[PDB]
Amino acid sequence: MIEVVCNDRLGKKVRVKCNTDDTIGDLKKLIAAQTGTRWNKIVLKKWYTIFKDHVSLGDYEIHDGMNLELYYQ
Amino acid sequence: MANRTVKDAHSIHGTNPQYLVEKIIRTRIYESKYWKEECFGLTAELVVDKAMELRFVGGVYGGNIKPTPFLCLTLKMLQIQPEKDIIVEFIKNEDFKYVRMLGALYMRLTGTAIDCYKYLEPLYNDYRKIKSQNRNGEFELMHVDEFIDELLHSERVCDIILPRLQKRYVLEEAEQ
Amino acid sequence: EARKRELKKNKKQRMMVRAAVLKMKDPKQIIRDMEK
Amino acid sequence: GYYCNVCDCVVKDSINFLDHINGKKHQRNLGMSMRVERSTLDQVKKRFEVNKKKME
Amino acid sequence: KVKRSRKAPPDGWELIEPTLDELDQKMREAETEPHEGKRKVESLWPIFRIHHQKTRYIFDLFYKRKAISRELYEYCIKEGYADKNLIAKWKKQGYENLCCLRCIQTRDTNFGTNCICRVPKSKLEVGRIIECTHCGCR
Amino acid sequence: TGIFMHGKIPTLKISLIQIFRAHLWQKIHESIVMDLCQVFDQELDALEIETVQKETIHPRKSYKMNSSCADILLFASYKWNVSRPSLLADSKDVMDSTTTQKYWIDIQLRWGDYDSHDIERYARAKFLDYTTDNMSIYPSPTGVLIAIDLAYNLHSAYGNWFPGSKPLIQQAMAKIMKANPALYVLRERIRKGLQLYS
Amino acid sequence: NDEEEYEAWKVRELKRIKRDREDREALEKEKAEIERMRNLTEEERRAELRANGKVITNKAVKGKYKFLQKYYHRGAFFMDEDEEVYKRDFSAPTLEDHFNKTILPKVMQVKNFGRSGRTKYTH
RNA sequence: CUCCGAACGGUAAGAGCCUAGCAUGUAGA
RNA sequence: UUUCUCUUCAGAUCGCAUAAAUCUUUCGCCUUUUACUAAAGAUUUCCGUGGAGAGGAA
C-alpha cells in the first residue's frame, strides 16, 4: 500500500499512507486527519496540476513518495 | 479601491471590518471575473438592482475556488456596511427572496446575537424553494427552513466560517 | 562540488552580459533614440 | 486588444484589463466616485420601483 | 457579575440583588459599548464611573448605613463585586472621593497612582479647564 | 515547451531546452491538429460530418496543462448517436448515450517519465478533470482528449465516441505518430544531442 | 404544489422542534444515564451485568510491523466522524518495508547521512 | 517489536503596459 | 499578627526533581551548514528557593 508525502515549505511536511485503488476524497480526509484543517478546504497541486476530488489515485498513477505541494482553499 | 466603505467603519468586533470572511476566499473574490463589473461603487441603491438579478444562494464551486455572485455580493454589501434600517427593510421583504436571504446572512455576520434571533426567527415559516450551487458545480433545490437551520444550528452553511453565535439555552436563562 | 559554484558564476556573468547587451541597444536606448 | 480612451493605455488581456479602470489614476482624475451611503428611503425607492418595473 | 462561589450566599443577600444587578447590567452595557466616539480613552471613563458607583453602594451598605452584616462586607469582596484596597483608600481622611489615578503627582507609576480627583478644587483645573486622562474626575 | 523536471539539474535542463530549440510543441500541436483535420476531411460524409471547425486555440494551449481547450470542433450531420466513454483499445463499446450536434477534440502532449508510462491513465485523468472543472472553455460535452507520450512513443485516448470512430482514429493515430514530420524532428534532435548515430 | 409544501413545512418544523427538546433533555439524560449507571455500578450485579457495547468511534485494527516498518501515526485530528477511510489497518509496508531486512549484512536503518538516532528495541 | 525529521544547497535573466494593502501627525508665519 | 517593596549573604539533596545554551574532549553520523546522537568536565540563562536592614495596610 502507498505512502504519500503531502508536503509544503511552510511548516507542513506530512506523510499520509494512501490506499492503492482509492479515491482522493479519502486522501483529503487523511490529509486533514494528519494536518489539522477542514476536509473541504484542502487543495493538492503539482505545478497547477490540480488533482480533483473524484479522479482516482491510480488514475494519475501516484506511487510511493510522490510529494504534492499542499495548498488551502 | 476595495479597502473600506467610504472613509470610516464601525468595526465588527468579531474579527475585523472586511476580514470576517477567510482571507483566502476574500482574495479569491477579488481575483474573480464578477469583481470586474459592479465593483466601480455600490453604496445603497444599486445594490438592490444587482441583488435581485441573481437567483442563486451559494458559496464556492469548482476545483479552483469559484465564488458565486451571491457570495461576492454579500462581500460587497459587507464592505459597503449599510445601516440597520435597510437591512430590516430587506428582512421584511416577501416578494423578493434572495434579498431577504442576504439580509439574514449579513445580519448573522453583522449584528448582536439578540438581534440575530429577533430578526431571523420569523424566517422559520418559508417552505418555499431555494437554489444553491454545490461544491462540484451541480445545483440543488433546498428549502429555506433547511437553510436557516444550517445557518443557526450548523456551522459554515456557506464557505464562510461563522463567529460562534451563542446557544439558545443561555439566552433563554438570561433573556428572550 | 565547487564546479557547481563555478558554473553558477559563469551563468551569472553571461546573464549580466546578455542584460547589458539588451539594455544598451534597448528599445528605450537604441530604438528610442532611432526616432530622435 | 483592450485600449482606453481617457486612461491612454492598452491592456493585452481581459481580466488584467478589468482590474485597470476600477481604481485607475486617470479614472480617479475623471472624478472621485467614493460610495456615498444613501438615505434609508433610497433602498425603499430601489425596492418599490424595481418591484413595479421588473415584476409589474 | 455573579458566576459562582462554591457555596451558598449569606442570609442578607436577597436585598442586594436588584440594585447590584442593575449596576452590573450597566457595566455589561459599558463593556460591550462601541469604540466609535471615544477619542482615545473616553471608553474607559464610564467603566471607572460604574466601578465607583458599585463601591459606593456596597460601602454605604457595609457600615455607613450599618445595614449589611459582617459576612457580606467581606464575602461581597471575597467574590468579585468591589475593591478592598480601594475601600481601605477611602478609610483615610483625605481620600474622600476620586478615581484610581488621573490627576495625581509622580507616584510609583510614572504618570500617577493617587487619584483622578486628587487635584485640589482651589488651584487645579488650570485657568478654567478641568479634566483627567484616566477617569476625567473634574 | 520543455514540460518540467525536479531538482535543479542544470545539465539535463540545458539538454532539454536544447532538445526544443524554437517553439516546438506549438509546431507539434499545429501539425497534429492539421493531421487530424485532414484525416477528418478524408471521410466527411461517411461520418456524417458537416465541416472541420478547428478552434482558435490559444498560442500556448499545447504547453498549458491546468486547462484543456478544444483542439478541433466537429459538426455532425443530424441525429448523431453517441457511445459511452471508453478506451481506444476497448472493443466492447457501449452505444447507449445521448446525441450531440458538436464534438470536440483536445490533443495533449505528455512528456512522461518512468512513473508515467500509463498513457490511458493520464488521458482519462485529464479528460475527467477538464470535463468536471468549471473553468475551461468547453462548448460540447461529448469529446475526446487523445494524448501522446513523447518521451516513450506511447499513444492513448479516451472519451465520447463516434459511430465507426474507434478503428478510424486508431489507424489515424498509428499513421500519425509514425511518419510525423515534427516527430521525426524530435527523434533527430534527440539522437543528435545523445550521440547515437545509427 | 402548495398543499404539499405546507405539509412538509410542518415535517421540518416538527423535526427541528424535536431536536431542541431532545437537546435539552440530553443534559438530564446524560446525568440520568450516569445515575442509572451509578445504581448499576452500585447494586446491579457483581460481575453479572454489562448492558454495554464497548463502542469505539474508529477501531484501529492493527497488524505486525515486519522488522523495521515505520511507526505510522494516523493523526488524531478527526475521529468523532467515524469515517470509513480510517478503518484500513495501517500495518503494511509503505515504501521500503517490502524487503525482509534480515538478509542484509548487519543492519541498515538509513544511509541518508543522518543517522542521529540509535535504537531498535533489543533490550 | 512501534525511533516518526525539517530548512538551505531549487525554481534563468529580460525590455513595453497596468493595478495596491501600507506610512507623517511637525516646525513656522 | 498578615502582606508588597531590595540594595544584601547563600555551598543546606539552597529545589526528596530536573530545563536549555556556550566552551573543551570522546563516539555515531556525515553531501555543505544549521537542526543532531550519547558520555565526561567547566561557565552562564531561565521556573525558583533560603536568611538579614529600612520603607508602605489590616
UniProtKB/Swiss-Prot annotation, chain B:
Major localization class: nucleus
Keywords, sorted A to Z: Coiled coil, mRNA processing, mRNA splicing, Nucleus, Phosphoprotein, Spliceosome
Gene Ontology molecular functions: RNA binding
GO CC aspect terms: nucleoplasm; nucleus; precatalytic spliceosome; U2-type precatalytic spliceosome
Entry-annotated residues carrying Phosphoserine: S11
UniProt-annotated location(s): Nucleus
Example of a GO biological process term: mRNA splicing, via spliceosome
Region ranges (N-terminal protein interaction domain): 1-176
Functional note: Involved in pre-mRNA splicing as a component of the spliceosome.
Subunit and partners: Component of the spliceosome B complex. Interacts (via N-terminal interaction domain) with ZMAT2 and MFAP1.
Family (UniProt): Belongs to the PRP38 family.
Name of the protein in question: Pre-mRNA-splicing factor 38A
Source organism: Homo sapiens (Human)
Gene it is expressed from: PRPF38A
From Swiss-Prot, chain C:
Superkingdom per UniProt: Eukaryota
Record field: compositional bias (Basic residues): 5-14
Location of this chain's protein in the cell: Nucleus; Cytoplasm
Tissues showing expression: Ubiquitous. Highly expressed in the heart, pancreas, kidney skeletal muscle, placenta and brain (at protein level). Weakly expressed in liver and lung.
Function: Activates pre-mRNA splicing. May inhibit PP1 phosphatase activity.
Subunit composition and interactions: Interacts with PPP1CA, PPP1CB and PPP1CC. Interacts via the PGR motif with PQBP1 in the nucleus. Interacts with the WW domains of WBP4.
Clinical condition linked: Vertebral, cardiac, tracheoesophageal, renal, and limb defects: An autosomal dominant disorder with incomplete penetrance and variable expressivity, characterized by cardiac, vertebral, tracheo-esophageal, renal and limb defects. Some patients also exhibit craniofacial abnormalities.
Name of the protein in its database record: WW domain-binding protein 11
Organism, scientific name: Homo sapiens (Human)
Range within the parent protein: 24 to 59 of 641
Curated annotation (Swiss-Prot), chain F:
Tissue-level expression: Widely expressed.
Localization per Swiss-Prot or TrEMBL: Nucleus; Nucleus speckle
Annotated TM spans: none
Region called Restriction endonuclease homology domain, residue ranges: 24-195
Disulphide connectivity of cysteines: none
Disease: Retinitis pigmentosa 13: A retinal dystrophy belonging to the group of pigmentary retinopathies. Retinitis pigmentosa is characterized by retinal pigment deposits visible on fundus examination and primary loss of rod photoreceptor cells followed by secondary loss of cone photoreceptors. Patients typically have night vision blindness and loss of midperipheral visual field. As their condition progresses, they lose their far peripheral visual field and eventually central vision as well.
Comment on protein domains: The MPN (JAB/Mov34) domain mediates interaction with TSSC4 and SNRNP200. Has structural similarity with deubiquitinating enzymes, but lacks the residues that would bind the catalytic metal ion.
Protein name per UniProt: Pre-mRNA-processing-splicing factor 8
From Swiss-Prot, chain G:
Cross-link Glycyl lysine isopeptide (Lys-Gly) (interchain with G-Cter in SUMO2), sequence positions: K87, K101, K111
Localization terms from the record: Nucleus
Phosphoserine carried by residues: S91
Superkingdom, taxonomy of origin: Eukaryota
Record-stated family: Belongs to the MFAP1 family.
Record text on subunit structure and interactions: Component of the spliceosome B complex. Interacts with PRPF38A (via N-terminal interaction domain).
Function text: Involved in pre-mRNA splicing as a component of the spliceosome.
Protein name per its UniProtKB record: Microfibrillar-associated protein 1
Organism of derivation: Homo sapiens (Human)
Stretch of the intact protein here: 271 to 393 of 439
